[PDB]
Design a protein around this ligand. Sequence first.
Ligand SMILES: Nc1ncnc2c1ncn2[C@@H]1O[C@H](COP(=O)(O)OP(=O)(O)OP(=O)(O)O)[C@@H](O)[C@H]1O
Ligand SMILES: Nc1ncnc2c1ncn2[C@@H]1O[C@H](COP(=O)(O)OP(=O)(O)OP(=O)(O)O)[C@@H](O)[C@H]1O
Ligand SMILES: Nc1ncnc2c1ncn2[C@@H]1O[C@H](COP(=O)(O)OP(=O)(O)OP(=O)(O)O)[C@@H](O)[C@H]1O
Ligand SMILES: [Mg+2]
Ligand SMILES: [Mg+2]
Ligand SMILES: [Mg+2]
Lengths: 92, 92, 92
Amino acid sequence: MKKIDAIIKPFKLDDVREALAEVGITGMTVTEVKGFDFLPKVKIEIVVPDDIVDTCVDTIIRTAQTGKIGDGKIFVFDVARVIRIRTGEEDD
Amino acid sequence: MKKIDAIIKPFKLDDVREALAEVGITGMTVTEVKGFDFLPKVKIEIVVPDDIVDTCVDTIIRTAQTGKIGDGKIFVFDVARVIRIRTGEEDD
Amino acid sequence: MKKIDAIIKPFKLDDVREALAEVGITGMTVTEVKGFDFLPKVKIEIVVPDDIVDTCVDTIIRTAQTGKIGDGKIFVFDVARVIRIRTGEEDD
Ligand SMILES: Nc1ncnc2c1ncn2[C@@H]1O[C@H](COP(=O)(O)OP(=O)(O)OP(=O)(O)O)[C@@H](O)[C@H]1O
Ligand SMILES: Nc1ncnc2c1ncn2[C@@H]1O[C@H](COP(=O)(O)OP(=O)(O)OP(=O)(O)O)[C@@H](O)[C@H]1O
Ligand SMILES: Nc1ncnc2c1ncn2[C@@H]1O[C@H](COP(=O)(O)OP(=O)(O)OP(=O)(O)O)[C@@H](O)[C@H]1O
Ligand SMILES: [Mg+2]
Ligand SMILES: [Mg+2]
Ligand SMILES: [Mg+2]
């Protein structure tokens, strides 16, 4: 699986959530951050299966972009293990 | 080494800290986050040696779980380098 | 590219920003975090080309250190993909 970090404009969060939900991604973690005096941003983190990474990245690009400055970046990371606390089950 | 991200219920932080301290892990970084309208969560990040990753994951699972919905996830990442700012010493 | 996470004392942020700007690094994401009852810290995240990782790490070490306790750590991660939301262009 991969972790996708998207740093976006705060008012683009509901756009991105809505569009991701359409391609079936709903679980996400959101952090308030400062982007560099600074601009408030939100950091979206979602961990998804490898075969939907492209769909997710593309979806975030399409929805979060304004064509203007400050639209933000997407960072994708390899994830070694994913464990559910409820059950102890590993990876997904 | 590995970085362990645990997204948990906020009132489970002291449980997890206490239990980790028992197996000798005390250094951690904590972030307030929103989990998906949303529920407040805390993100615990700890960077540990490879041979205690299992112990830590298991400890977090045992302490943070409620058997119910919302218990959260653990994400484990490879860490390329770990440097101490005090001394410049690399990895651990 | 690599992602560099530096957990530092909050009043060291402008020091680090200023010094990084000198070696040409200006884009960064900053998060308020708690370091372990706890001390307020700031988490700096910057994603940089491989050949300036050493320069950046060294710069953060030199500027952020006080020689005393609590100076913090630098964690370096491999980054699979970096995508700009404005253009959809991948990696850098
Ligand atoms: N190297 C980096 N490390 C961590 N975060 C970054 C980095 N570069 C940019 N960011 C985050 O991205 C935000 C700015 O995005 P950016 O302005 O680069 O968008 P863009 O898609 O390149 O559009 P434009 O270039 O037109 O502004 C910053 O607020 C910052 O939080
Ligand atoms: N794909 C993901 N990316 C980032 N964060 C996530 C992801 N999935 C879940 N989370 C975080 O985990 C929290 C929810 O955990 P979750 O409800 O999945 O726990 P669980 O152990 O699966 O228990 P249950 O399935 O019974 O709820 C969310 O609030 C969110 O912050
Ligand atoms: N294993 C870890 N995982 C995540 N964050 C950590 C970890 N260890 C330390 N940190 C972060 O680093 C901060 C403390 O840094 P630390 O005190 O280790 O600095 P140092 O350079 O080792 O100096 P000294 O050892 O003299 O205090 C903590 O507040 C915490 O947020
Ligand atoms: Mg909107
Ligand atoms: Mg409690
Ligand atoms: Mg200062």
